[PDB]
């Protein structure tokens, strides 16, 4: 529970970067959760061959 000993390759810090400026913003936040959703649509018809 020491923290600030973040392991490499998975450092859990949220960095938000403006797309034209390319400089970090809103580094004053203290985030508690993150969710990622990646949906897709699949056909639902009998299909023929």
């Amino acid at each position: 529970m020491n923290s600030f000993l973040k392991s490499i390759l998975n450092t859990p810090t949220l960095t938000i970067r403006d797309d034209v400026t390319k400089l970090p913003v809103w580094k004053s936040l203290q985030v508690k959760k993150v969710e990622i959703y990646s949906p897709a649509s699949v056909v639902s018809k009998p299909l023929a061959t």
Binding site: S41, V42, V43, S44, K45
Partner: protein
């Protein structure tokens, strides 16, 4: 149903692509023409028989108007499709 395809479309986009088709019966006649001269003075039933032979269909006729003489029945028919309109026109609405 028996018919020929007339109109094509596309209805639904992917993932499932669906099409819509329009078919009509005896649409082949809208292109085919007439090459057998219709009878001049004749009864109704013989006009119907000539039309059936021209289109190429088995026919059945059963009307009370089977013994009526018509003069120049179909002398103004361009293609094979207007034969049916001619046949229906004379004794509307009793004769269908």
């Amino acid at each position: 149903f028996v018919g020929e395809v007339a109109i094509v479309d596309i209805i639904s986009p992917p993932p499932d692509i669906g099409i819509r088709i329009q078919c009509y019966t005896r649409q082949i006649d809208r292109t085919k023409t007439i090459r057998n001269m219709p009878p001049a003075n004749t009864t109704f039933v013989k006009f119907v028989e000539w039309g059936a032979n021209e289109m190429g269909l088995n026919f059945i006729c059963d009307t009370s108007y089977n013994d009526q003489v018509l003069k120049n029945p179909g002398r103004s028919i361009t293609v094979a499709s207007a034969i049916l309109a001619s046949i229906q026109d004379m004794y509307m609405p009793d004769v269908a």
